[PDB]
Symmetry: C4
Subunit: 326 residues, 4 copies
Amino acid sequence: CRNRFVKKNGQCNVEFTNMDDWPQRYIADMFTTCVDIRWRYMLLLFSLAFLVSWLLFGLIFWLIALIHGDLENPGGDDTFKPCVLQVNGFVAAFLFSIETQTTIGYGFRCVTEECPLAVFMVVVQSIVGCIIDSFMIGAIMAKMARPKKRAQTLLFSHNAVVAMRDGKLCLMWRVGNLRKSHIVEAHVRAQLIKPRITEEGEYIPLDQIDIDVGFDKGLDRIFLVSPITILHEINEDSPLFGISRQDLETDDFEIVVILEGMVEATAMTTQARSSYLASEILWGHRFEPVLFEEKNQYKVDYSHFHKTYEVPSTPRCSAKDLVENK
Amino acid sequence: CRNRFVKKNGQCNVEFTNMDDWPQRYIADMFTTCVDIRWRYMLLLFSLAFLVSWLLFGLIFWLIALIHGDLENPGGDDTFKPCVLQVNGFVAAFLFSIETQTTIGYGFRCVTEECPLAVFMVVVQSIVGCIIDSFMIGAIMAKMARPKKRAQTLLFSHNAVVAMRDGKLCLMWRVGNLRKSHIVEAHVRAQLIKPRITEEGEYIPLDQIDIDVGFDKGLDRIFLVSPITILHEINEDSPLFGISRQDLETDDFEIVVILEGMVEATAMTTQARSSYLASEILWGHRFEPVLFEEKNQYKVDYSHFHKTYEVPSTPRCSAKDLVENK
Amino acid sequence: CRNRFVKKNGQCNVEFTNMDDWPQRYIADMFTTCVDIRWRYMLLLFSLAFLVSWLLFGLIFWLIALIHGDLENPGGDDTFKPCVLQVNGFVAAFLFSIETQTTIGYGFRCVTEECPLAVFMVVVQSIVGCIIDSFMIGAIMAKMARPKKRAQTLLFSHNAVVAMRDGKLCLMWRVGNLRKSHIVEAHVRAQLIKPRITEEGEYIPLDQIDIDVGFDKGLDRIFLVSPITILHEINEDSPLFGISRQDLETDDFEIVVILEGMVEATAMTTQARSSYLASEILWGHRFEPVLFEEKNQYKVDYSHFHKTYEVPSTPRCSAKDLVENK
Amino acid sequence: CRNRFVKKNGQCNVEFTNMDDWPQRYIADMFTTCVDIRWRYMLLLFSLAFLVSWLLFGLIFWLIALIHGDLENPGGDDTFKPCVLQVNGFVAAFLFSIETQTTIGYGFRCVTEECPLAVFMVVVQSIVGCIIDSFMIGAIMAKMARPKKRAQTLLFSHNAVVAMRDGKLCLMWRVGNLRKSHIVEAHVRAQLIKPRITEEGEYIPLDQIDIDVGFDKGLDRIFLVSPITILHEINEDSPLFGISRQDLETDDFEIVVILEGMVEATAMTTQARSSYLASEILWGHRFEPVLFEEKNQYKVDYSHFHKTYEVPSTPRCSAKDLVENK
Ligand SMILES: [K+]
Ligand SMILES: [K+]
Ligand SMILES: [K+]
Ligand SMILES: [K+]
Ligand SMILES: [K+]
Ligand SMILES: [K+]
Ligand SMILES: [K+]
Ligand SMILES: [K+]
Ligand SMILES: [K+]
């Protein structure tokens, strides 16, 4: 009923306001800012950087030509050599600047030995060009390689389920890899999200309470080839210990699930997230299998990935009742 | 007898099917897609990107020339200046485009000050060229540096063995580094792979059960210089606790072994994998030593790396029988 | 009263002296040195590298021209071909060098087929140019992407507080993310900093004593969306166990707090730090909430991020007195 | 007496032999191979790649010219247009190739519209040039950024010491950072290295036995600002439990120490190593302090970093005798 902290696709559902000093901080952390903005604006920013550098140096070569008399004798002759051949106006100056900085250098417009200032500006523009190119290459390479995109080829089940396994009542969900390339050093986390009032009267708008999936024995670390069903044993230390089927069907909470690991090609950590509201957890269900053996290999049928089937033998009471009654 | 989850060389033996939305996901995660495809196709993709950009701008300069009258007077004269000198047909237009975007700029074909649209297109093509170059550099650099390749210079023993060490029955295998450069933050994992039916009747096509190699004390973390024999103590918490030599010789299961760590040069995590079927585990054997001391250094003879020798004193019963009988 | 180990902004307050061999070590670890120096000097270093390479090759082409007779016949004729057309003096030689190495190549100054040494030098200069460009690109890209900058968009509360939660006396501080992009694999640490004399009489100028915030259960690992209040339970193993409110108000110590995690875009680890002196810890206070629900989402009001309010019911004695008395 | 596994500077003292398939493996893992070889050879390899590509395309343009008749009419005329202007011999062909691939493009030698094959080869050479440049940039950037170099600005003490602290006998050594930039996520390890025969008679040429420095409580994780003395408590689980001062002075073993963490600028993990032979451990000594307070900051005097002073009260018996006697 209460709206969700993170959406089914992993997007977090929180807006930040009154962050009054954000412009100064985003400027101080400019690179992060640059790679976070969408492609349109980042490429526009670098376009502007090129345009502005080309125009500035264009203006300088035009002024050098103006003062030297080159606009009146752009090709030169036996008794007059221009600072830069064929700068006859602002457009030609702009072209020479572009041709120099891009290093295209068609050469109709061409610096001469005559003016030390012109030679110096070609030196400076060349160095500046290399600097700007380096910034652009770096920004583009970083934005290209962003590992959050890998979450698009990782899959959480639409539902979580509650069912008995090896004598214990467990909360379960499924994760899968949609590529042949791996997620290295892969590991899973989960949290129960809900508001809470402490015994001292402190209101916590959204508390984040750990859902144990094996950390203490390193069993949170998974080797993900075929889809794996992640298990949370509901025992005396679980926050779901006193939750029966009926409680679940009239409760208001959210289970956030996280898969973290490194994109194999780049070794860069991605964080894939999803969320199960109380109403999206199916008590007394198990996932249909997807893995089956063939002649010389195994195969995964992903069309059954999200499918569940009901298990009538599943206890309807809480895990606490299971121990209390026994 | 049943076919293997991962091959001796670490390749996983699972095919994915009915992943109906894969094209849209692979497009959304395009960079991962690009660096995963083989060199042939990635380089072909970038070749096409260059060709297409060169052709498009080629067409634009040709059209500008056509409409301006330049095809009829490509060199210009006292009363007529072309938008781009020497564009006399489509091939010349294409050459000018290539020369501009690559920044070769031979300069026979050369933009003039005459046409604002031509100057604008040189600006746009230059920026576009830098963008495409940046994408290619990024993709090539990423594909070049892929740390999975480092597994080619890491070595697992062909067999695992079962033998007594310091009073305990242990499953053992060997790992080695085939370079002088290190694997930093190196650590080991193992899993027993087999189908299983739970007491509730749930069939698990392939369950993955942890094989303890010291995680709980940080002893899974290794300093790998000379080859190390990795040890799994078969005790009451091991899934091999009730497995005797005879059981092993008529059993059907697989032990997957993993070595993870960072390539020293790049600090990028590699995951090296191998596999031991029940029939590839040699009960009552130990590995021959490879390390020996010389005058001023140690030496490793890798020709004995895979070699084992039998130990007749090795108990033939399970670890459970060892405790039960004593 | 005693001055602080780390400042409120995370900067460490320690100077190093008599590090006599630092120049040799900084040279051996040159890349780290280069990316650590400020932008001004790094860009100046690369400017000098370009200038020096351009001048050196400039000198070589000038000498080739001098010895070949080209200074007297720079354009050549029917019976004489220069090594490089239009090298008529040192400035022209310098221009040709720049034009070759930058790859601008205007082409007025142009190598010919005549002199094998000139052709060889163009080959060598081209390769050298690519090497220097590669070093510059690498250095700039690394310096641009430095993840310490991300700490500018992470926020620690100005104060820490001491208050009761769920029946325990806890030291608390707040951390927040000032961007929509995440800090992946995020985790927290804290240390109490103070001088100490051991029972053996050894003086420790500043000892660093761990402040437990959940490491042993993996609860130091956080999922940071909206601001989180980090909790240190003051129990029998805490170094604050015997510290009452009055002790705190007349004590001399510092609590350093650390948030580490990976910048989402680059997966590069950042370390954000802050510090609370004894006098900056507010006994009997709690943080005002910042998170509230709207129609379809949650919102964080960062203007209340640092705000606290007093809780008169808070015990004034130490946690040790709480157990001792009960 | 027995020679050391790792040298005082961290270099490992082990040679590998009879690695018969190493060439094929080093080729399969070519990038690692390339960045591991010294600068001389890596830069030579890329030099050769340029030379070979320039020569090959040089040969192709020469052959095109030869067959087309261009060698006899290199400048062309009203009734004859060459494939590439001014290719009059092999050197000119080679120059055109260089000028095209480097993108210098002086333009005296210049492709025309005449020959589709010549245009195609300029296309192919341009793409090939970009590919080779990308490989070189990637290799150089990777080699430049190698984090092992950071170990040159990290420091281990020359000696380790044994002394009492807070009532326990401890093995101690010192680590320091020689830069203002940090080692993030820093943590320490240690191992005792020696040969061993198991109770079953198995000879282990060099066993590696963990030296506990706090892993189980996360105290192996350090915040390294000023130099820190790392502590190993010699208790019943330590391999040094039964080692007295006299034992130490006539024993043969080695303690390897490791500091791992991320270079702040690049977030790349470095591994710094050192070693203490039994004879390099000073029983009954402590390190001189280096940290002292000034007016507004702290200062570290690194000239006392390695210095120790004797503590006559230090027990001379083993830690086992300390408990056994008490
Ligand atoms: K160029
Ligand atoms: K040119
Ligand atoms: K533990
Ligand atoms: K000309
Ligand atoms: K370039
Ligand atoms: K990188
Ligand atoms: K880690
Ligand atoms: K050029
Ligand atoms: K030119």
